[PDB]
PDB file of C-alpha atoms and ligand atoms in Angstrom:
ATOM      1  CA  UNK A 469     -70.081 -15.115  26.856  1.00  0.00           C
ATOM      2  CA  UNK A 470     -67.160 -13.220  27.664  1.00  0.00           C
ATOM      3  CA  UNK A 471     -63.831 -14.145  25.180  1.00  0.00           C
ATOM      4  CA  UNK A 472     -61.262 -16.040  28.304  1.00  0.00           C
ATOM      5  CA  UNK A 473     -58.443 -16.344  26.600  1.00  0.00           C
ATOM      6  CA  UNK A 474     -54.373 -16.664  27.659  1.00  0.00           C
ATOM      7  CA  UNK A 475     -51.899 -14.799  26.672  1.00  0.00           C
ATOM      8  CA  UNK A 476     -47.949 -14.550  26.748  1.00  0.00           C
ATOM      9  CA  UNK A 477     -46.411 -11.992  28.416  1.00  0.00           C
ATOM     10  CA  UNK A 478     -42.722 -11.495  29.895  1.00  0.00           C
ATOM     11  CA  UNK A 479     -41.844 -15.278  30.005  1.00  0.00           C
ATOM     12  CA  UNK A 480     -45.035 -15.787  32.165  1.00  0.00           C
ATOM     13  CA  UNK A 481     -48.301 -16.573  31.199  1.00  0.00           C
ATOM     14  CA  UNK A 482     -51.821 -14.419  31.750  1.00  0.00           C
ATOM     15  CA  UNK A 483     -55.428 -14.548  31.642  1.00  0.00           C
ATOM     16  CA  UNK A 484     -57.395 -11.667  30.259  1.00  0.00           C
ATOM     17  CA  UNK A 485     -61.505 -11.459  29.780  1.00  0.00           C
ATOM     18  CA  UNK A 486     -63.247  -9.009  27.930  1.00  0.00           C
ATOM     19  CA  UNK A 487     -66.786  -8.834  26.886  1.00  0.00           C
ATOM     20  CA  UNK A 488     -66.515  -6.404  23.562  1.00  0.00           C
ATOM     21  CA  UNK A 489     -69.296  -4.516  24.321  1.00  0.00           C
ATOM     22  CA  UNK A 490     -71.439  -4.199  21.265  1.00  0.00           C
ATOM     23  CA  UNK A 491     -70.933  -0.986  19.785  1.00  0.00           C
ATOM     24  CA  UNK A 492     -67.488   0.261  20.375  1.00  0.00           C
ATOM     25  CA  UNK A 493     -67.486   3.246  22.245  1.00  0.00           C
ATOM     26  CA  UNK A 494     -64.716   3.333  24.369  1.00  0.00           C
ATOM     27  CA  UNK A 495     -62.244   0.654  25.894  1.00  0.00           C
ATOM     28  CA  UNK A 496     -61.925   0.604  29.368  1.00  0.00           C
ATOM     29  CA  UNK A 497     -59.203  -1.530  31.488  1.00  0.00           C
ATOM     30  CA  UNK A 498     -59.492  -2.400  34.656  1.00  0.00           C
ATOM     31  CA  UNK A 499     -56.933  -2.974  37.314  1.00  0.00           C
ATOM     32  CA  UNK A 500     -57.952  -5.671  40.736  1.00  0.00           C
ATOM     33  CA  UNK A 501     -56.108  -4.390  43.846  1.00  0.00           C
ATOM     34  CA  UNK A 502     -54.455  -6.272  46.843  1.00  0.00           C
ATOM     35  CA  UNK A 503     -52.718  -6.949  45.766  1.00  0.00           C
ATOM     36  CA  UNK A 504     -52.143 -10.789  45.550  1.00  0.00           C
ATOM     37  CA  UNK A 505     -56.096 -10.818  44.389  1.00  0.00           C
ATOM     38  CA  UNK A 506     -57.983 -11.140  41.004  1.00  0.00           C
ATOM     39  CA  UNK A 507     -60.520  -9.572  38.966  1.00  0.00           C
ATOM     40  CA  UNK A 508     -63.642 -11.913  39.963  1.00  0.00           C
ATOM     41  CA  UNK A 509     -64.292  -9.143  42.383  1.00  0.00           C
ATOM     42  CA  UNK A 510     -64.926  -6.726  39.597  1.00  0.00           C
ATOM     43  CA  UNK A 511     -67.152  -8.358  37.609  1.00  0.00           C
ATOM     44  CA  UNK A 512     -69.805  -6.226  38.126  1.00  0.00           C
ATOM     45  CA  UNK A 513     -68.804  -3.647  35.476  1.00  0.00           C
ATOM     46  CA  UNK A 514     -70.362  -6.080  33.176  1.00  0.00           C
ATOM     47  CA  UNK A 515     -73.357  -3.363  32.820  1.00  0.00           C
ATOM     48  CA  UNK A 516     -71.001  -1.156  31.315  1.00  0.00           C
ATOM     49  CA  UNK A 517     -71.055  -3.146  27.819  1.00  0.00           C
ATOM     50  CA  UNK A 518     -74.363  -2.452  27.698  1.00  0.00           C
ATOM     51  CA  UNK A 519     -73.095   1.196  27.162  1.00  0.00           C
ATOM     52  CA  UNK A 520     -70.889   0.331  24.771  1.00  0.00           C
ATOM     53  CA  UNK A 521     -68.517   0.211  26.838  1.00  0.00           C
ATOM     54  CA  UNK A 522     -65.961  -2.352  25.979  1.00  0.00           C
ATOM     55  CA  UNK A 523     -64.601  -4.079  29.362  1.00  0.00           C
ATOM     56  CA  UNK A 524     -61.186  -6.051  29.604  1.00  0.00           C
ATOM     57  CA  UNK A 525     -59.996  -7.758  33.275  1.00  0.00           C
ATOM     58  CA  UNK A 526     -57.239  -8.963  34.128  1.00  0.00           C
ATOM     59  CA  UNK A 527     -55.013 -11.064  36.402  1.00  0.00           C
ATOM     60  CA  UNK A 528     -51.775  -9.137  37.641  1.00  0.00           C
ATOM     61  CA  UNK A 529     -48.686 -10.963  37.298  1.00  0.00           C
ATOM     62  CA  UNK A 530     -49.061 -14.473  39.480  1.00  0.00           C
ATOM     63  CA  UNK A 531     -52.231 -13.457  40.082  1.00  0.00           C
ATOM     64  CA  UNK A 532     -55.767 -15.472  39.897  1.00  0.00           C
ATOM     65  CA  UNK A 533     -54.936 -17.277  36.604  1.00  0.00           C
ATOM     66  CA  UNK A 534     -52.349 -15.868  35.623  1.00  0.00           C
ATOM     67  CA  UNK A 535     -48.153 -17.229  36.186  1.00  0.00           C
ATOM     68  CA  UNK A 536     -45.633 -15.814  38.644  1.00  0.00           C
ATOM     69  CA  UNK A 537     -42.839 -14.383  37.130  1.00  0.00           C
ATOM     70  CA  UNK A 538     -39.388 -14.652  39.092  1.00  0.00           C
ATOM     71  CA  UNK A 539     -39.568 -13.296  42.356  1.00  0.00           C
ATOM     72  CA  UNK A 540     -37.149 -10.588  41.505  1.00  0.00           C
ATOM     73  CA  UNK A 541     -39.487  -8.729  39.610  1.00  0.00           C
ATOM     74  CA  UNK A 542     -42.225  -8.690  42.641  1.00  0.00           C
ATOM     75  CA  UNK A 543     -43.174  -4.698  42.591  1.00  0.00           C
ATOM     76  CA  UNK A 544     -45.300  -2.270  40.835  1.00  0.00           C
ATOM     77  CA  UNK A 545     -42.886  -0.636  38.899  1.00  0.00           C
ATOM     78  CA  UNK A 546     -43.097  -4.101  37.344  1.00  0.00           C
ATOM     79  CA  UNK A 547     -46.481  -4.876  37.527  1.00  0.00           C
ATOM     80  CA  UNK A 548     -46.913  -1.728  35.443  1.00  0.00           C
ATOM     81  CA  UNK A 549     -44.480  -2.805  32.524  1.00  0.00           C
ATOM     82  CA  UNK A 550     -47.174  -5.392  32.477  1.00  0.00           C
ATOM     83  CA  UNK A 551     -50.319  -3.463  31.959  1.00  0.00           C
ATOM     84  CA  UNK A 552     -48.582  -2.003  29.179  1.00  0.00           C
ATOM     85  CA  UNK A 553     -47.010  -5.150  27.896  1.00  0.00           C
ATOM     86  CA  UNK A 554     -50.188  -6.452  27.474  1.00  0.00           C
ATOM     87  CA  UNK A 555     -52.603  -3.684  26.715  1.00  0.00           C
ATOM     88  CA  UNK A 556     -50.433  -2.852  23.515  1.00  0.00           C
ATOM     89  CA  UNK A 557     -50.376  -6.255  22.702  1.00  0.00           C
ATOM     90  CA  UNK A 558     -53.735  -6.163  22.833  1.00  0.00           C
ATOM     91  CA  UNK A 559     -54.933  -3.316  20.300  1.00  0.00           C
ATOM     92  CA  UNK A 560     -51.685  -1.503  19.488  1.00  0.00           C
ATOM     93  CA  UNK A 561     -52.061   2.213  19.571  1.00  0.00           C
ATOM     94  CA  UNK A 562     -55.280   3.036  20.441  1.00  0.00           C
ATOM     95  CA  UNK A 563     -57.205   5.365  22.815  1.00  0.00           C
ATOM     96  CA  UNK A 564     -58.009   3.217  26.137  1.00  0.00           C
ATOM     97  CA  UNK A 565     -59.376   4.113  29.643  1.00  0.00           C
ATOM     98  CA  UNK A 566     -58.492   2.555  33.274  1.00  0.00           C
ATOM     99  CA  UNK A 567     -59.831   1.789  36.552  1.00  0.00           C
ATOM    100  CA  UNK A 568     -57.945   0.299  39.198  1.00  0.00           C
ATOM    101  CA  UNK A 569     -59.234  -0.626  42.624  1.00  0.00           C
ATOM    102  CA  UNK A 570     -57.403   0.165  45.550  1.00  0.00           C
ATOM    103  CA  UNK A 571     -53.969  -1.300  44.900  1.00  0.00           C
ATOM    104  CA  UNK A 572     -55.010  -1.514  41.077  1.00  0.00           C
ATOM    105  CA  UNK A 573     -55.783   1.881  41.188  1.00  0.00           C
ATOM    106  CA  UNK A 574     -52.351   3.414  42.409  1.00  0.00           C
ATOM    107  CA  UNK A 575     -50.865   0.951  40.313  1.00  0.00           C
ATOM    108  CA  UNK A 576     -53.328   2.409  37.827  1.00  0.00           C
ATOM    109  CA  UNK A 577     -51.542   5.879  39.221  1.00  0.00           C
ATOM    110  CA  UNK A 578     -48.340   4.962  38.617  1.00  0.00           C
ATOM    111  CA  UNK A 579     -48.551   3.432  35.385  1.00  0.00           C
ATOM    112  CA  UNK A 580     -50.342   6.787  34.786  1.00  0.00           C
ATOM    113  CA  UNK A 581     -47.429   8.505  35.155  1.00  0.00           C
ATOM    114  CA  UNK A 582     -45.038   6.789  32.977  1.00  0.00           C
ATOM    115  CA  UNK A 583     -46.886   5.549  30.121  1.00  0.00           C
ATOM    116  CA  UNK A 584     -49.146   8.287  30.196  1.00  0.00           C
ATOM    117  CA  UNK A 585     -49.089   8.705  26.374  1.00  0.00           C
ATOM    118  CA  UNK A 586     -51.513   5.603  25.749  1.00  0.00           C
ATOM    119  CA  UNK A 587     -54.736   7.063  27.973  1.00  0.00           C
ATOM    120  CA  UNK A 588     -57.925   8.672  27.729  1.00  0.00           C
ATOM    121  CA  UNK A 589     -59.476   8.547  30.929  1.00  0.00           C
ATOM    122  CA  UNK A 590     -58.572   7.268  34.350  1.00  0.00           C
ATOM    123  CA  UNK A 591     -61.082   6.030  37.277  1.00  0.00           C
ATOM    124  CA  UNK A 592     -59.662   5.273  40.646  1.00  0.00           C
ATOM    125  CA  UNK A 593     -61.970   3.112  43.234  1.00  0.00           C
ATOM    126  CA  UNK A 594     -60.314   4.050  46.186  1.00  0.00           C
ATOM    127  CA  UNK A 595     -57.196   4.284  45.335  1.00  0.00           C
ATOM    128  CA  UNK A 596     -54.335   5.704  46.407  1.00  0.00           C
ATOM    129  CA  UNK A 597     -50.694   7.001  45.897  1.00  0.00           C
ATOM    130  CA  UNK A 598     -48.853   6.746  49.519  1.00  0.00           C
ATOM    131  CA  UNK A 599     -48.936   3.153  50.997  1.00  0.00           C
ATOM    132  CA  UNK A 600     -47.605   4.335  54.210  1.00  0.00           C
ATOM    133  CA  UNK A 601     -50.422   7.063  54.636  1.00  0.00           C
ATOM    134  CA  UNK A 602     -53.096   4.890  53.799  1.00  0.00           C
ATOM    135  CA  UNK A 603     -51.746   2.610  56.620  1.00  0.00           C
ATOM    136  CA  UNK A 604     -51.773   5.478  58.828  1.00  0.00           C
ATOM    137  CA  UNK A 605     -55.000   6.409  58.393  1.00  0.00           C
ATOM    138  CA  UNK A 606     -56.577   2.724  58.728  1.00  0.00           C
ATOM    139  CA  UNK A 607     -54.710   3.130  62.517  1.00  0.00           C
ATOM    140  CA  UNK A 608     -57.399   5.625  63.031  1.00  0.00           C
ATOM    141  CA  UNK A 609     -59.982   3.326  61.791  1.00  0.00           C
ATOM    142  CA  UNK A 610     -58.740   0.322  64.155  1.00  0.00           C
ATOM    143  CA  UNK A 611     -58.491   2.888  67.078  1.00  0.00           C
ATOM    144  CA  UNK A 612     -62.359   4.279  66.338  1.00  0.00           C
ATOM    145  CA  UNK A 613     -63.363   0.305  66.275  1.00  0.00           C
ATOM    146  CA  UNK A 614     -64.643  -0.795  69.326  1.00  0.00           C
ATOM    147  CA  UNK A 615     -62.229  -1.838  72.367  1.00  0.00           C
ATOM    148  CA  UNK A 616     -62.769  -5.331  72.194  1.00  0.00           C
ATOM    149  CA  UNK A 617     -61.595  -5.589  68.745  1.00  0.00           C
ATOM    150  CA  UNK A 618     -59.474  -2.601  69.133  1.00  0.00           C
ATOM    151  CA  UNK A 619     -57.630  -4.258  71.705  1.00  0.00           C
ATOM    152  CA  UNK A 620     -57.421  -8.026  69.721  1.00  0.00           C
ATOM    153  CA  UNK A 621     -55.461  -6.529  66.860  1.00  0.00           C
ATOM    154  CA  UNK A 622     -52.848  -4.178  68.114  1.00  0.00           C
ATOM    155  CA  UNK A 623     -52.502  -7.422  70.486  1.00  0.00           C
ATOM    156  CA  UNK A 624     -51.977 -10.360  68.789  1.00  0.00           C
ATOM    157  CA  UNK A 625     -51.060  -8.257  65.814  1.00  0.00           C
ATOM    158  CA  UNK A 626     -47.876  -6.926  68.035  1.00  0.00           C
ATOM    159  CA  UNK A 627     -46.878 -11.224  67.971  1.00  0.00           C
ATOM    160  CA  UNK A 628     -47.911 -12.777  64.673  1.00  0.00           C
ATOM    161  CA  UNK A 629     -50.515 -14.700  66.136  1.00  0.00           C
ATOM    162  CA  UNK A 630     -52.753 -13.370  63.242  1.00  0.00           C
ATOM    163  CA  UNK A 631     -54.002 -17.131  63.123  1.00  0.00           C
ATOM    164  CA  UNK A 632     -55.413 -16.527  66.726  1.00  0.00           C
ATOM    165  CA  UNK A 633     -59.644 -16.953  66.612  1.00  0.00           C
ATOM    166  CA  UNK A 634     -60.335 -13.768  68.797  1.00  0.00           C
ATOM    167  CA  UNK A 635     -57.825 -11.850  65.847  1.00  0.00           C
ATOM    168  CA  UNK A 636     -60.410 -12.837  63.056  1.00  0.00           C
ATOM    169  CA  UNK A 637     -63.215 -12.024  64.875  1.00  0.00           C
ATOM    170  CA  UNK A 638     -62.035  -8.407  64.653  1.00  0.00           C
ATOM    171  CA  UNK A 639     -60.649  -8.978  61.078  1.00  0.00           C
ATOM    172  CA  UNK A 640     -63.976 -10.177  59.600  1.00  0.00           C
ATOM    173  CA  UNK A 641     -66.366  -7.655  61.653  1.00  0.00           C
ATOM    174  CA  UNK A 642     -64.218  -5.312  60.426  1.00  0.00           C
ATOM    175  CA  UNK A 643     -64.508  -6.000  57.242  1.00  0.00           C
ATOM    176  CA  UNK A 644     -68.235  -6.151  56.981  1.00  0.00           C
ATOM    177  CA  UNK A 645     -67.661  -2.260  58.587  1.00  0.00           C
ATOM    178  CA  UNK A 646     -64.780  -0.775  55.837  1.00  0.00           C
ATOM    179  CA  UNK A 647     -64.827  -3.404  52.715  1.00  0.00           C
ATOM    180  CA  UNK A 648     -68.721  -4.545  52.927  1.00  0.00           C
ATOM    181  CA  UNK A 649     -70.892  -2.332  54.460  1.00  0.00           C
ATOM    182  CA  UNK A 650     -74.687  -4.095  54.950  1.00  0.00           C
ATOM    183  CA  UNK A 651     -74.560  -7.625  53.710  1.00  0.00           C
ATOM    184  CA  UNK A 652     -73.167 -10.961  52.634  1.00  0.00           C
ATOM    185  CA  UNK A 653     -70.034 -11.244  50.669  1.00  0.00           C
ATOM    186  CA  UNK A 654     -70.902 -12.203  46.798  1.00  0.00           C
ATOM    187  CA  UNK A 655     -69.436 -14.891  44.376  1.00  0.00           C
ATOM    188  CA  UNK A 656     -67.300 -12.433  42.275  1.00  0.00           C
ATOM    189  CA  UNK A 657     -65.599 -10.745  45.527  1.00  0.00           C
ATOM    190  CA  UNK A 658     -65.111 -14.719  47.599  1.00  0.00           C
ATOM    191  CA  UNK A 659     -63.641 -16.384  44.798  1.00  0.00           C
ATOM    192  CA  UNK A 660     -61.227 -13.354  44.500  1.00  0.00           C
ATOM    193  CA  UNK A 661     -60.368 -12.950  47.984  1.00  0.00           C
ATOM    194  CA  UNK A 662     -59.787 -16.246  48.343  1.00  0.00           C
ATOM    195  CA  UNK A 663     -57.384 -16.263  45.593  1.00  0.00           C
ATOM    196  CA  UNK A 664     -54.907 -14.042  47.685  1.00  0.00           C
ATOM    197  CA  UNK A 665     -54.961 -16.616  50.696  1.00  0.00           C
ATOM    198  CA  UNK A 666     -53.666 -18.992  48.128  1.00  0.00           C
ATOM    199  CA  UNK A 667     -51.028 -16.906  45.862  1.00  0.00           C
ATOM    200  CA  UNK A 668     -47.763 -15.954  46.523  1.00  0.00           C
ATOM    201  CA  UNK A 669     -48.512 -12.656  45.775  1.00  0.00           C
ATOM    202  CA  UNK A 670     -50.602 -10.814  48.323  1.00  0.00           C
ATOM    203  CA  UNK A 671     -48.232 -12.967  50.850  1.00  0.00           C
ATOM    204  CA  UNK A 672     -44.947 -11.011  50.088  1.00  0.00           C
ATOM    205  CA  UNK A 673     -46.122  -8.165  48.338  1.00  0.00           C
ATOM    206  CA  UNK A 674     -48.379  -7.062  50.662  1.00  0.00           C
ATOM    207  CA  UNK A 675     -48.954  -8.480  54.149  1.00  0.00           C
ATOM    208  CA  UNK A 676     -51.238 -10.710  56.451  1.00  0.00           C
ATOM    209  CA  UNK A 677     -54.106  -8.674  55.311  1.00  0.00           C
ATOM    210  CA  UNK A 678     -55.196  -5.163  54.157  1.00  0.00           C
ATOM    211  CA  UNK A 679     -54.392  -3.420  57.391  1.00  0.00           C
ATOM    212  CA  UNK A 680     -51.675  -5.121  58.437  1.00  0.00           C
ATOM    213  CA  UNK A 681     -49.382  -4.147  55.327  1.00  0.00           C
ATOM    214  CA  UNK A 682     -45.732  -5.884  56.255  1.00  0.00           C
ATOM    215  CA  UNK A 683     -45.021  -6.390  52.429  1.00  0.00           C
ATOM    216  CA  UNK A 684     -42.825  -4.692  49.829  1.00  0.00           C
ATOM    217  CA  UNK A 685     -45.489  -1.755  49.178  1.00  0.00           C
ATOM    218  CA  UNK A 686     -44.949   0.202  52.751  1.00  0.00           C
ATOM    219  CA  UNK A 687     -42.149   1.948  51.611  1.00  0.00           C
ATOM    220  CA  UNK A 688     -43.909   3.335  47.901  1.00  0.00           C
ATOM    221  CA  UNK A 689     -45.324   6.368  48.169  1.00  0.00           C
ATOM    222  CA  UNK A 690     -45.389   8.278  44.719  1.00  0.00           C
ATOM    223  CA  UNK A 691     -47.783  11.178  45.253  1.00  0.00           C
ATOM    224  CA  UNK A 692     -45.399  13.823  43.935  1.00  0.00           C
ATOM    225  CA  UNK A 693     -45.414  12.074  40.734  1.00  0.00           C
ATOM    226  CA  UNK A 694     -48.955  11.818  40.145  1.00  0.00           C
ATOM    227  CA  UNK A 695     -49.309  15.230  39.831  1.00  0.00           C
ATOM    228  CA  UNK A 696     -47.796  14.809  36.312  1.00  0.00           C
ATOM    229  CA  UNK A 697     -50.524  13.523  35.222  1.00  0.00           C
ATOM    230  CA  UNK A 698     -52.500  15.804  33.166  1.00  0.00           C
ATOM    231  CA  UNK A 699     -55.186  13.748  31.170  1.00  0.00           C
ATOM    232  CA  UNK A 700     -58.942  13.484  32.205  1.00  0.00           C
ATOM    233  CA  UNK A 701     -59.548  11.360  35.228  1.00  0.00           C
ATOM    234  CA  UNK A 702     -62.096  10.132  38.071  1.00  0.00           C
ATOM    235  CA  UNK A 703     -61.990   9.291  41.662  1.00  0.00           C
ATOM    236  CA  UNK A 704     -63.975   7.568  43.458  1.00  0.00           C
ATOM    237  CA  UNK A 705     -64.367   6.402  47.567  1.00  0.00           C
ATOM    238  CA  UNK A 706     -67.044   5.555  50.163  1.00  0.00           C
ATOM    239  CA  UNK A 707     -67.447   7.350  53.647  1.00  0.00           C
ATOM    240  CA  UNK A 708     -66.348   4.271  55.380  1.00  0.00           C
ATOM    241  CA  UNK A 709     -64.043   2.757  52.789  1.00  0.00           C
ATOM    242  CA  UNK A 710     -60.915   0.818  54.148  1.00  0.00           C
ATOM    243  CA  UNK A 711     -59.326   3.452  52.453  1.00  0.00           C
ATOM    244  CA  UNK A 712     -60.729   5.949  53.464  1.00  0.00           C
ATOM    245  CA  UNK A 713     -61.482   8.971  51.379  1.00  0.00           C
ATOM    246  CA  UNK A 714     -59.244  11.270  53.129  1.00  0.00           C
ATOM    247  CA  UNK A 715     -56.882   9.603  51.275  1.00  0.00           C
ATOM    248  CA  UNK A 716     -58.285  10.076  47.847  1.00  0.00           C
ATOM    249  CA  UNK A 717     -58.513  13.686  48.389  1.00  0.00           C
ATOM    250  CA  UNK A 718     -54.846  14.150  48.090  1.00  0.00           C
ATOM    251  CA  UNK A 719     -54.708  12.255  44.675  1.00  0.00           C
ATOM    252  CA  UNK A 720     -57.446  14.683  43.673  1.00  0.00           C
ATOM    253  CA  UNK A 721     -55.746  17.337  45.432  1.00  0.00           C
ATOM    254  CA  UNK A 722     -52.275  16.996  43.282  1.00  0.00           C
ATOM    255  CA  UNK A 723     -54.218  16.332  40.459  1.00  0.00           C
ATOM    256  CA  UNK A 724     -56.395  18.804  38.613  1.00  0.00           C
ATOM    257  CA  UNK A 725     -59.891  17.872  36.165  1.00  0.00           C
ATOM    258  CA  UNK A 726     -60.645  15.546  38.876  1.00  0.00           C
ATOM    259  CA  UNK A 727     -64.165  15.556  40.347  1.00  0.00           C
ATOM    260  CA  UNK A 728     -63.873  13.438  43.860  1.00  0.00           C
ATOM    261  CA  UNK A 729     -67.486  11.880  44.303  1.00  0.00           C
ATOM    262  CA  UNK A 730     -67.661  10.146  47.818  1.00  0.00           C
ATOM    263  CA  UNK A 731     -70.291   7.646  47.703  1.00  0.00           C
ATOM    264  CA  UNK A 732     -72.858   7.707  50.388  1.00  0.00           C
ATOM    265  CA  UNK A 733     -73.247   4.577  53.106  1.00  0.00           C
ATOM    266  CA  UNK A 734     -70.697   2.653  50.806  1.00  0.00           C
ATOM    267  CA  UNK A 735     -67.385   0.679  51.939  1.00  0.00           C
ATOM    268  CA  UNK A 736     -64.702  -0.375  49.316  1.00  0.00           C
ATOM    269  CA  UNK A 737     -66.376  -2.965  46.835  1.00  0.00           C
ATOM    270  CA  UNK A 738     -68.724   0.041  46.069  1.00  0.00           C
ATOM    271  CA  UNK A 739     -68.818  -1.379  42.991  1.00  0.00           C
ATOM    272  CA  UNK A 740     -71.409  -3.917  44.704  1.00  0.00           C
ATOM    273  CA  UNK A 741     -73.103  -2.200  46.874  1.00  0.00           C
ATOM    274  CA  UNK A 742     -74.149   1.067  45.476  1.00  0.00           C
ATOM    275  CA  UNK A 743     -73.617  -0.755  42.129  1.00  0.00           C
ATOM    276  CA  UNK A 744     -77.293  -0.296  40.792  1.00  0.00           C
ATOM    277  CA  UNK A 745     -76.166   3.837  40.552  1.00  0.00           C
ATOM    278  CA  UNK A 746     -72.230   2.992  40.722  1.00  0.00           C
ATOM    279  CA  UNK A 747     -71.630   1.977  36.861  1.00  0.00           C
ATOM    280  CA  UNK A 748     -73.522   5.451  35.649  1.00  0.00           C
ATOM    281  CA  UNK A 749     -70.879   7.310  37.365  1.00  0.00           C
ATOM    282  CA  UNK A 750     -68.033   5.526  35.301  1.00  0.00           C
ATOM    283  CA  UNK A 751     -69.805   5.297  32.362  1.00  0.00           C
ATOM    284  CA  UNK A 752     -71.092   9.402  32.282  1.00  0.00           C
ATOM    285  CA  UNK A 753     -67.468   9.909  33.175  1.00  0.00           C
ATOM    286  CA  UNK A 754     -66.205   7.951  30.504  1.00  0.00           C
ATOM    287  CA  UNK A 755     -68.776   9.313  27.363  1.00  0.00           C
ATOM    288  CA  UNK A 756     -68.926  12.695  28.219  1.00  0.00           C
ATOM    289  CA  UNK A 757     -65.107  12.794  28.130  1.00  0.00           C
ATOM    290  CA  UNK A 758     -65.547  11.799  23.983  1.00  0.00           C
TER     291      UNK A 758
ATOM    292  CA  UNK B 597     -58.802 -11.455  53.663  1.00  0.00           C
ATOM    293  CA  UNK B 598     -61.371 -13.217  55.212  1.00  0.00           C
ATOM    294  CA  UNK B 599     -64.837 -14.499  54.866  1.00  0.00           C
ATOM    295  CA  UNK B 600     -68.258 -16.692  56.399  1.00  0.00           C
TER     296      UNK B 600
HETATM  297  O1  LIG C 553     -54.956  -2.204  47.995  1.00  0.00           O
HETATM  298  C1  LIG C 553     -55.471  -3.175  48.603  1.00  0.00           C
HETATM  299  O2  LIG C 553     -56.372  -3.901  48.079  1.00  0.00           O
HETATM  300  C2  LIG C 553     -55.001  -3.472  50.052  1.00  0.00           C
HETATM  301  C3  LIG C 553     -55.888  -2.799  51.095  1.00  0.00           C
HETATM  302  C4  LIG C 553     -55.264  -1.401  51.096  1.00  0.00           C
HETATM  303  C5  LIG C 553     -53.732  -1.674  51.042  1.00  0.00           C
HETATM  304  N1  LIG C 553     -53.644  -2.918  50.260  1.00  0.00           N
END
């Protein structure tokens, strides 16, 4: 019986949930990657009230829920403002954690950097800081997949014909191989997904899909900034996550206090998977660090 | 994103 209300924001609209944990420990925001997606996907941290850890979600600007705002403003350096925007509007000044996932989570970065002065903590999912390596590493993936499928994209990828049938069958296999490891998508994450193959968002601000990043996030790459940050934080990744944690490294590389835990046999929504252990993590990050 |  989580509190789903709207709220105001920059001329657009957005919808935030939180479900105030009982006792007020700590107040952790999270961030949805993508981007073009929605929280529904991260749902799952819903254990963490139960530590008393107060949870608020969140629909990015024209995301889920939430209203586009004019086109111009279609970055992260925007989406950012936002966070802020909000999150002060929300409880003023007061000491508050994050955790974005994947695209949430650099955006989580670079909002880091900035407005730096209004955090406590900081857990990454998977994150990461430069687009364009990310990319370059999920070639690798592709190119370890096997030929059939290995073949399909680079093929009808090189043409547009991402509609093509023998393109998904790659696209969803793959998936179940770097987003879901062992199973069947849940509620939270479909709902969510499908959101972004129905905004505007994920469309121009990102690309045809997660590998295939044509949007305006190729170019950012702002991991000589994150080393500015100097408060607490926590990164986390999965052996065969889409992004995979050779990427994270860096981020923990350029910045110090970080303690890097790759999650064994998990893909990206690790929050799922692992889940049952996943949560502790965050949470004995986030208490400890009182 | 896709899904079955
Ligand atoms: O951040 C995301 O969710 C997608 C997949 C990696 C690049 N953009």
């Amino acid at each position: 019986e989580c509190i789903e209300n709207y709220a105001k924001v920059n001329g657009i609209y957005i919808y935030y949930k939180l479900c105030k944990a009982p006792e007020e420990k700590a107040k952790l925001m999270t961030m949805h990657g993508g981007p073009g997606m929605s929280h529904d996907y991260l749902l799952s941290l819903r254990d963490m009230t139960k530590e008393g850890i107060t949870v608020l979600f969140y629909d990015q600007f024209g995301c889920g829920r939430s209203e586009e705002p004019d086109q111009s403003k279609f970055t992260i350096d925007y989406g950012v403002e936002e966070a802020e925007a909000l999150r002060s509007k929300l409880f003023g000044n007061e000491k508050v954690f994050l955790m974005g996932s994947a695209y949430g989570g650099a955006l989580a970065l670079a909002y880091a950097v900035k407005y730096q002065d209004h955090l406590k903590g900081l857990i990454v999912s998977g994150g990461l800081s430069s687009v364009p390596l990310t990319v370059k590493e999920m070639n690798r993936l592709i190119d370890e997949l096997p030929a059939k499928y290995r073949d399909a994209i680079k093929k009808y990828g090189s043409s547009g014909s991402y509609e093509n049938p023998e393109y998904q069958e790659a696209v969803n296999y793959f998936y179940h191989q770097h987003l879901l490891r062992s199973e069947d998508w849940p509620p939270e994450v479909l709902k969510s997904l499908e959101y972004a193959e129905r905004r505007n968002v994920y469309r121009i601000m990102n690309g045809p899909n997660e590998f295939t990043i044509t949007g305006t996030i190729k170019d950012w790459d702002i991991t000589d900034k994150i080393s500015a940050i100097k408060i607490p934080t926590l990164i986390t990744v999965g052996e065969y996550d889409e992004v995979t944690p050779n990427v994270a490294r860096v981020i923990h590389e350029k910045i110090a206090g970080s303690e890097l835990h790759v999650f064994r046999d998990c893909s990206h929504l690790t929050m799922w998977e692992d889940r049952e252990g996943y949560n502790k993590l965050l949470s004995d990050f986030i208490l400890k660090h009182l | 994103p896709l899904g079955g």
